[PDB]
């Protein structure tokens, strides 16, 4: 077993600028085939023995954007300071 | 005397950018010679007869500003829209 991750339930939420549902990261991440342990707010991911890709937080991030679909990450444009 | 306007407490603060001492707005409006009575957060402001200029709260945003003095107005740029 590759080492645990410890990531916030709502970090995928915040990277896609999408709310999606309760426990959609925790699925998900069970899916691609990790253990999830719920601490509070806290998840503790250990992706599985064929997935060595998955070291950061954000490696999971990209686990759950992929899954849940790119096409429902709405468009908005950033706050850019005046040049 | 003119009739009375309402504003919000805090309004010269936001229209200024800058956070004034508590009891600012209310002090420099009965200064310029204005009955100023207090119902929450809103402040109930009837100038003077010998001033018919201020008729809307922007005219009493004026008399904070100018006697706090614009210099304390700070200079920050606003964010760059999508142009
Ligand atoms: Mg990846
Ligand atoms: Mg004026």
Request: glycine share 8%; charged share 20%; no cysteine.
């Amino acid at each position: 077993s590759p080492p645990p991750i410890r990531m916030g339930v709502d970090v995928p939420d915040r990277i896609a600028g999408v709310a999606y549902p309760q426990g959609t990261t925790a699925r998900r991440l069970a899916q691609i085939g990790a253990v999830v342990t719920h601490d509070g707010d806290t998840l503790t991911v250990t992706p599985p023995s064929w997935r060595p890709d998955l070291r950061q937080p954000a490696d999971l991030v990209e686990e759950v954007l992929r899954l849940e679909g790119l096409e429902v990450i709405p468009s908005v444009l950033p706050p850019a300071p005046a040049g």
